[PDB]
Amino acid sequence: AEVRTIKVFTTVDNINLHTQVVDMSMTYGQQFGPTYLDGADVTKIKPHNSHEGKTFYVLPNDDTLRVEAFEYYHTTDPSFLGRYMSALNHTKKWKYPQVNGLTSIKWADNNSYLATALLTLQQIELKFNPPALQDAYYRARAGEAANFCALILAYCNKTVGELGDVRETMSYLFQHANLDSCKRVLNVVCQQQTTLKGVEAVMYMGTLSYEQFKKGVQIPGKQATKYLVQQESPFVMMSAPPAQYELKHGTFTCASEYTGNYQCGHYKHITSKETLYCIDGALLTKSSEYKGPITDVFYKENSYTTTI
Ligand SMILES: O=C(Nc1cccc2ccccc12)c1cccnc1
Ligand SMILES: [Cl-]
Ligand SMILES: [Cl-]
Ligand SMILES: [Cl-]
Ligand SMILES: [Cl-]
Ligand SMILES: [Zn+2]
């Protein structure tokens, strides 16, 4: 016969390249195991002349690739890279319009939760620990958000099409961020002080109102009053089961609204600027106040000490 070869590069992080000489009579799968080209699964495809010099993603199946993969992604989940490529093959087809100066996402594949989460990140002070999220988030800020969206889906174990919860998505992103400074001190009355650190310092479930949190809130044999003693964080995220709630200009940073039923609904994003903007993927509307089924509100913070 004839024995044709081309040079290609393999990678796990798209920075460190590994020279390979491949045989054009055999599948990528036969030579590398699972192989991807900008998200497309090429496992079962033979190399084409047009592939010469291109970078393919492979699985971290030896020690060089494992160390590179862990240093870049901070995960040893063996399905991670497959899940990332699968998502990226869809997210690179989404549109990321600039809406009121923020990178949003045009509705597709039930992605409203991601669009609100992405708009929220652009309004709060947060730095990611994995280089993969640092690099993708920098590009997402500049308007090329496909990698960042595909990484969020991979790190949160969501496939394209699956509706997620904004609070849970933010929770997972927060676990991969530098929130070590963050500290909350609470008191309860039936006294009992507690101290929360990192992610648990910036999140509360039960009330949307930061004001109401500082004054105190009823909770579980009769009732008890919980209130905010001290807060050290650049923001706080107040969450509750979706319920009609009134948002007013200048009283909050941003918020997520959830309409519809369990596992069949739609998020919109409200931002407080010169007035209230409702951002619904590519869609933009304004009002002086906003009433809706709110589930999350974000507030700016630095340092707070009670006067109780
Ligand atoms: O119920 C939801 N979110 C939640 C909000 C508040 C409290 C919750 C408690 C348990 C489960 C989901 C909750 C939900 C459902 C479908 C899509 N997105 C979100
Ligand atoms: Cl996917
Ligand atoms: Cl949706
Ligand atoms: Cl970052
Ligand atoms: Cl991390
Ligand atoms: Zn009691």
CB 262 within 8 A of CB 293: no
Q: Residues near 120 by Cβ (< 8 Å), separated by ≥ 6?
A: 166, 170, 254, 256, 269, 296, 298
Smallest CA separation from ligand 1 atom 10, residue? 241
- Using CB distances shorter than 6 Å, the residues near ligand 1 are 163, 165, 241, 258, 262-263, 265, 295
Considering the domain architecture, whether residues 307 and 187 belong to the same structural domain is answered as yes
Considering the domain architecture, whether residues 124 and 52 belong to the same structural domain is answered as no
Considering the domain architecture, whether residues 192 and 203 belong to the same structural domain is answered as yes
Give me the phi and psi of 18, to 5 degrees please: -120, 110
Question: CA 130 to CA 118: how far, in whole Å?
Answer: 17
CB 156 within 8 A of CB 149: no
Question: CA 220 to CA 280: how far, in whole Å?
Answer: 37
Burial letters 267-302, b for 16+ CB under 10 A, else e: bbbbbbeeebbbbbbeeeeeeeebebbbbbbbbebe
Considering the domain architecture, whether residues 111 and 88 belong to the same structural domain is answered as yes
Q: Measuring CA to CA, how many Å separate 75 from each of 70, 83, 108, 213?
A: 6, 12, 28, 35
Question: CA 75 to CA 132: how far, in whole Å?
Answer: 11
Residues with CB in 5 Å of ion ligand 4: 127-128, 134, 137
Considering the domain architecture, whether residues 283 and 194 belong to the same structural domain is answered as yes
With 0-12 CB in 10 A as exposed, 13-18 as middle and 19+ as buried, what is 68? middle
Smallest CA separation from ligand 1 atom 15, residue? 262
With 0-12 CB in 10 A as exposed, 13-18 as middle and 19+ as buried, what is 34? middle
Considering the domain architecture, whether residues 219 and 193 belong to the same structural domain is answered as yes
Smallest CA separation from ligand 1 atom 18, residue? 165
Angle between helices 146-155 and 80-91 (to 10 degrees): 140
Long-range Cβ pairs for the range 44-50 (8 Å, 24+): 47/6, 47/8, 47/22, 47/23, 48/24, 49/6
Q: Using alpha carbons, select from 209, 289, 280, 279 the residue that is nearest to residue 249.
A: 289
CB 271 within 8 A of CB 197: no
Give me the phi and psi of 233, to 5 degrees please: -170, 155
Beta strands in 112-211 (DSSP E): 183-189, 192-197, 203-205
Residues with CB in 5 Å of ion ligand 5: 74, 129-130, 176
The single residue listed with the structure tokens 């597709």 is 108
Question: CA 146 to CA 141: how far, in whole Å?
Answer: 11
Pocket mutation for ligand 1, best pick of 156, 238, 262 (most atoms within 8 Å of C-beta) = 262
Question: CA 60 to CA 43: how far, in whole Å?
Answer: 15
DSSP structural state of residue 181 = T
Considering the domain architecture, whether residues 119 and 163 belong to the same structural domain is answered as yes
Q: What is the largest CA-CA distance in the chain?
A: 87
β-sheet bridge partners, residue 39: none
CB atoms within 10 A of CB 135: 18
Residues with CB in 5 Å of ion ligand 2: 86-87, 159-160
Considering the domain architecture, whether residues 196 and 264 belong to the same structural domain is answered as yes
Q: Which domain holds residue 6?
A: 1-58
